[PDB]
């Protein structure tokens, strides 16, 4: 109580805004979960 | 928001300039009209 | 390097075609937050 007063953004409550994760495979190898993680972890 | 904040900071400076004019007038009246040995010495 | 350039090319093309913006309702609050923080600190702006 009264610990977050000047907080502009109150609560997002949405990580991916459609589901908890992807949970859907696609034949496009570039637009998939494998190339999305390999371009985010190994690359910077 | 750019037109709104331009008028808001101008009105905030005008109240600050009103505070600056009031603080300068009170300090000039207390320094001139001294309670003891103003201009007799 | 080919995968990093192709993923940036598809993301920049998606930013113009689609609208992954900066949440324009809250973006007016972020511009007001920096305007209030600079006025509270009374910092002069960078001159020409």
Curated annotation (Swiss-Prot), chain A:
Transmembrane segments: none annotated. Disulfide bonds: none annotated. It is found in: Nucleus. Involved in pre-mRNA splicing as component of the spliceosome. Component of the PRP19-CDC5L complex that forms an integral part of the spliceosome and is required for activating pre-mRNA splicing. As a component of the minor spliceosome, involved in the splicing of U12-type introns in pre-mRNAs. Identified in the spliceosome C complex. Component of the PRP19-CDC5L splicing complex composed of a core complex comprising a homotetramer of PRPF19, CDC5L, PLRG1 and BCAS2, and at least three less stably associated proteins CTNNBL1, CWC15 and HSPA8. Interacts directly with CTNNBL1 in the complex. Component of the minor spliceosome, which splices U12-type introns. Belongs to the CWC15 family. This is Spliceosome-associated protein CWC15 homolog. It comes from Homo sapiens. The lineage of its organism: Eukaryota, Metazoa, Chordata, Craniata, Vertebrata. The gene is CWC15. The chain holds residues 186 to 229 of 229 of the full protein.
Curated annotation (Swiss-Prot), chain B:
This is SNW domain-containing protein 1. It is found in: Nucleus. Identified in the spliceosome C complex. Associates with U4/U6-U5 tri-small nuclear ribonucleoproteins (U4/U6-U5 tri-snRNPs). Component of the minor spliceosome, which splices U12-type introns. Interacts with SKI, SMAD2,SMAD3, RBPJ, RB1, PABPN1, MAGEA1, SIRT1, FOXN3, U2AF2, DAXX and ATP1B4. Interacts with PPIL1. Interacts with VDR and RXRA; preferentially associates with VDR:RXRA heterodimers. Interacts with NCOR2. Interacts with MAML1. Interacts with NOTCH1 NICD; the interaction involves multimerized NOTCH1 NICD. (Microbial infection) Interacts with human papillomavirus type-16 (HPV16) E7 protein. It comes from Homo sapiens (Human). Involved in pre-mRNA splicing as component of the spliceosome. As a component of the minor spliceosome, involved in the splicing of U12-type introns in pre-mRNAs. Required for the specific splicing of CDKN1A pre-mRNA; the function probably involves the recruitment of U2AF2 to the mRNA. May recruit PPIL1 to the spliceosome. May be involved in cyclin-D1/CCND1 mRNA stability through the SNARP complex which associates with both the 3'end of the CCND1 gene and its mRNA. Involved in transcriptional regulation. Belongs to the SNW family.
Curated annotation (Swiss-Prot), chain C:
It is found in: Nucleus; Nucleus speckle. Widely expressed. Part of the U5 snRNP complex. Component of the U4/U6-U5 tri-snRNP complex composed of the U4, U6 and U5 snRNAs and at least PRPF3, PRPF4, PRPF6, PRPF8, PRPF31, SNRNP200, TXNL4A, SNRNP40, DDX23, CD2BP2, PPIH, SNU13, EFTUD2, SART1 and USP39. Component of the U5.U4atac/U6atac snRNP complexes in U12-dependent spliceosomes. Within the minor spliceosome, which acts on U12-type introns, interacts with PPIL2 and RBM48. Core component of U2-type precatalytic, catalytic and postcatalytic spliceosomal complexes. Found in a mRNA splicing-dependent exon junction complex (EJC) with SRRM1. The MPN (JAB/Mov34) domain mediates interaction with TSSC4 and SNRNP200. Has structural similarity with deubiquitinating enzymes, but lacks the residues that would bind the catalytic metal ion. It is linked to Retinitis pigmentosa 13: A retinal dystrophy belonging to the group of pigmentary retinopathies. Retinitis pigmentosa is characterized by retinal pigment deposits visible on fundus examination and primary loss of rod photoreceptor cells followed by secondary loss of cone photoreceptors. Patients typically have night vision blindness and loss of midperipheral visual field. As their condition progresses, they lose their far peripheral visual field and eventually central vision as well. This is Pre-mRNA-processing-splicing factor 8. It comes from Homo sapiens (Human). The gene is PRPF8.
């Amino acid at each position: 109580r009264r610990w977050d007063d000047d907080v502009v953004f109150k609560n997002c409550a949405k990580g991916v805004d459609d589901q908890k994760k992807d949970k859907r495979f696609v034949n496009d190898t570039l637009r998939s979960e494998f190339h999305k993680k390999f371009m985010e972890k190994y690359i910077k | 928001a750019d037109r709104k904040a331009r008028e808001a900071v101008e009105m905030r400076a005008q109240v600050e300039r009103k505070m600056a004019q009031k603080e300068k007038e009170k300090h000039e009246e207390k320094l001139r009209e001294m309670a003891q040995k103003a201009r007799e010495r | 390097t080919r995968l990093y350039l192709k993923a940036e090319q598809e993301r920049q093309h998606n930013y113009l075609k689609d609208g992954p913006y900066i949440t324009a309702e809250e973006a007016v609050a972020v511009y007001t937050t920096t305007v209030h923080w600079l006025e509270s600190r009374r910092f002069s702006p960078i001159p020409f």
